[PDB]
Design a protein around this ligand. Structure first.
Ligand SMILES: [Ca+2]
Ligand SMILES: [Ca+2]
Ligand SMILES: [Ca+2]
Ligand SMILES: [Cl-]
Ligand SMILES: [Cl-]
Ligand SMILES: [Cl-]
Ligand SMILES: [Cl-]
Ligand SMILES: [Mg+2]
Ligand SMILES: [Mg+2]
Ligand SMILES: [Mg+2]
Ligand SMILES: [Mg+2]
Ligand code: NA
Ligand code: NA
Ligand code: NI
Ligand code: NI
Length: 717
């Protein structure tokens, strides 16, 4: 049947030939509502056991015997750097040597509980991103710790409560209940003889082999993490985005209450709200610092986005208008009609629409808006017997899938944020112009279902899991639905994730929905912060000296590398983390010197003096360092990348030529703004999406009054 949402609808009738994710979900009866996907723990759900689980600092893998535990040995040189999962020891069971599967029982914002059970025993494991601990509860027998070789025992004996061990050069604590004994010390398998009535057991990866360190880790070893939560707040007055991270602990014994949290660089860098412990871990993501506590916060400065750049460029206006007319002839001509390529086309129209309006090209404006609306209205309606341009709800997993699908959006739940971000961008641009169309009673209900599929914010709405594609702790998104790879989950295009997030900001502000807007600000701001570290390494302290590049195109749980999914040029390899370039893409230019370094690396790698291909994308990027040079190199012979247009490319470059480069040293008390700086002259741009005039104040003292539903630009003091 069919479910009405405002004036649109989705279906639960699968079109003929259409494919869905697998029927089998390796979950327990405790995991209710829509099933989380697109994360680091996801392979537990899709595979009988799991693929490697990249929590950090620890990694894991489920198998018939139990749970492999390890700390990756970092290495590699050149095109990739590796932190592969390896087995330092397997947490097995004294009487159950073969478990039939591993099933997810509970998934929180940065942890997972999984259960392995036979009729005669079980292990329940809690794996946590940002913890040096892993926590276990046994039934039917004892922990049987099967080491990869024989460990060195640096502390403890058969009668001690804990052991300090070293295996593969990695120090661990093994923490048993008071009253436990240990059998098999000196062999490759140590069994923890649990006392009657106590069945909890934990391990930690330690930063050293001192007894003092082991004592500190023992102090918190019995504070088992039972829930993890993020919360966020956008402060409009201060232009900041605050995120709180909270772990709930259940104290299994002792009088200590707390835990040790490990923080990635995007969390600890320049963070005045923490007092790190001495302990660090060297990980694939850089140095993880540690803190004592069950909560911490991060606070980032938000620098605004715009719905478009203003009409301030040094372009030949008649040529720009002609480019708009050239695009208008192709307004109804997507290169392909699956969700992804249809999206790319909708993004192209979304970026050209305001340029047509600025020029007074009503014919082209009308062609663009008409196609955007008619196509969204088609996609957002599932007609009986329709096989293309519709959304289907899978109620096994709990996901909205558009048909026709592509690149595993259907069977693998890949990439929904990438695909749907383009649809959301188009919807937002319509909403800024037409509050009637975007209302919940009209097309806004279906729009918000796409938002919920990729980024549901409401933990009580069980139709979609909480924040599907975004990983709150790594601070970025994940592309694979299942993470069914040795190297875990992956994301290549961070810029396509950010496109979805900027679109959510615009939608929320256009519709007056502060919850959705602030969700967008949270996602956007945090992903940008992660991107600046793990993709661009702006601070020059993430990437190994042995890694041969200043840029990683793909980030995995277990590696990062300068590769892409097809045999493209090095221009393509760099460009996938720029496109789509929108008026939310100024973050790419946080460090103009990095723009220069990144572009020059790309040229060296191509063996050319200009980009061999994707020259439009590359010159838009280079314009964040030298717009005059980018304008000079640009020309009409360039065949646009399929999601781009000559009009939008040249409007971008020529506006930066006039306005200057983005200036991140100034903020404002409004959500839609940007500041530009040309040779120390600032230009301030604001968009007011509300129905009342706004007074906008910048941190340097600039004040602008901006009328309802308008863009304003002011240069100088
Ligand atoms: Ca339809
Ligand atoms: Ca149709
Ligand atoms: Ca997620
Ligand atoms: Cl002890
Ligand atoms: Cl106690
Ligand atoms: Cl004309
Ligand atoms: Cl339809
Ligand atoms: Mg499984
Ligand atoms: Mg062994
Ligand atoms: Mg360095
Ligand atoms: Mg030129
Ligand atoms: Na190349
Ligand atoms: Na074009
Ligand atoms: Ni490169
Ligand atoms: Ni030309």
């Amino acid at each position: 049947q069919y479910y009405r949402e405002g004036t649109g609808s989705y279906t639960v009738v699968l079109p003929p030939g259409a494919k869905v994710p697998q029927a089998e979900i390796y979950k327990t009866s405790n995991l209710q509502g829509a099933v989380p996907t697109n994360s680091w723990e996801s392979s537990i759900l899709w595979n009988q056991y799991s693929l490697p689980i990249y929590a950090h600092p620890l990694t894991f893998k489920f198998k018939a015997e139990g749970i492999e535990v390890g700390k990756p040995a970092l290495g590699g040189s050149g095109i990739a750097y590796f932190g592969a999962h390896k087995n330092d020891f397997t947490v097995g069971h004294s009487s159950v040597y073969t478990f039939p599967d591993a099933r997810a029982d509970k998934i929180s914002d940065f942890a997972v509980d999984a259960v392995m059970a036979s009729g005669s025993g079980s292990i329940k494991a809690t794996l946590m991103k940002g913890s040096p601990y892993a926590y276990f509860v046994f039934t039917g027998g004892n922990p049987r710790i099967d080491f990869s070789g024989t460990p060195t025992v640096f502390y403890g004996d058969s009668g001690s409560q804990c052991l300090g061990v070293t295996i593969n050069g990695v120090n661990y604590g093994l923490f048993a209940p008071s009253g436990s004994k240990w059998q098999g010390i000196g062999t490759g398998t140590i069994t923890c003889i649990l006392p009657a009535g106590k069945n909890y057991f934990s391990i930690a990866v330690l930063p050293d082999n001192t007894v003092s360190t082991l004592t500190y880790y023992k102090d918190y070893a019995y504070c088992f993490v039972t829930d993890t939560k993020v919360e966020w707040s956008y402060n409009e007055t201060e232009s900041t985005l605050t995120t709180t991270f909270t772990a709930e602990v259940s104290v299994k014994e002792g009088t200590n209450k707390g835990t040790i949290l490990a923080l990635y660089p995007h969390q600890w860098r320049n963070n005045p709200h923490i007092l790190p412990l001495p302990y660090t871990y060297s990980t694939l993501r850089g140095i993880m610092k540690t803190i004592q506590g069950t909560s911490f916060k991060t606070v980032y400065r938000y620098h605004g986005i715009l719905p478009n750049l203003p009409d301030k460029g040094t372009y030949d206006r008649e040529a720009l208008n002609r480019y708009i007319n050239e695009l208008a002839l192709q307004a109804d001509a997507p290169v392909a009609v699956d969700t992804y390529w249809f999206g790319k086309h909708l993004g192209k129209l979304s970026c050209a629409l305001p340029i047509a309006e600025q020029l007074g090209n009503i014919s082209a404006k009308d062609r663009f808006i008409s196609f955007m609306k008619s196509s969204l209205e088609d996609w957002f309606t599932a007609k009986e017997g329709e096989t293309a341009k519709l959304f289907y709800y899978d109620s096994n997993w709990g996901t909205l899938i558009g048909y026709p699908s592509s690149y595993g959006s259907d069977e693998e739940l890949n990439d929904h944020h990438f695909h749907y971000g383009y649809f959301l961008h188009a919807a937002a641009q319509i909403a800024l112009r037409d509050p009637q169309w975007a209302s919940r009673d009209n097309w806004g209900a279906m729009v918000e279902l796409l938002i919920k599929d990729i980024a549901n914010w409401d933990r009580n709405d069980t139709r979609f899991p909480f924040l599907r594609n975004f990983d709150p702790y790594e601070g970025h998104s994940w592309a694979s639905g299942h993470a069914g790879f040795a190297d875990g989950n992956n994301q290549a295009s961070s810029s396509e994730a950010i496109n979805a997030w900027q679109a959510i900001i615009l939608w929320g502000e256009a519709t007056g929905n502060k919850t959705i807007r602030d969700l967008g600000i949270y996602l956007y701001t945090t992903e940008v912060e992660a991107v600046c570290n793990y993709w661009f390494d702006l601070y020059k302290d993430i990437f190994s000296p042995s890694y041969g590049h200043n840029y990683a195109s793909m980030v995995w749980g277990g590696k990062y590398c300068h590769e892409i999914w097809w045999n493209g040029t090095n221009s393509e390899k760099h460009g996938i983390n720029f496109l789509p370039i929108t008026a939310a893409s100024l973050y790419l230019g946080k460090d103009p010197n990095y723009i220069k370094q990144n572009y020059e690396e790309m040229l060296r790698e191509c063996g050319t003096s200009q980009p061999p291909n994707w020259k439009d994308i590359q010159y838009m990027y280079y314009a964040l360092y030298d717009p005059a040079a980018a304008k000079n190199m640009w020309n009409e012979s360039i065949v646009p990348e399929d999601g781009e247009s000559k009009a939008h490319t040249y409007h971008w470059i020529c506006n930066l030529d006039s306005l200057g480069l983005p200036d991140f040293s100034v903020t404002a008390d409004t959500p839609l703004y940007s500041v530009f700086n040309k040779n120390n002259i600032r230009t301030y741009v604001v968009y007011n999406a509300s129905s009342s005039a706004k007074k906008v104040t910048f941190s340097d003292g600039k004040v602008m009054t901006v009328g309802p539903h308008s863009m304003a630009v002011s240069t100088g003091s």
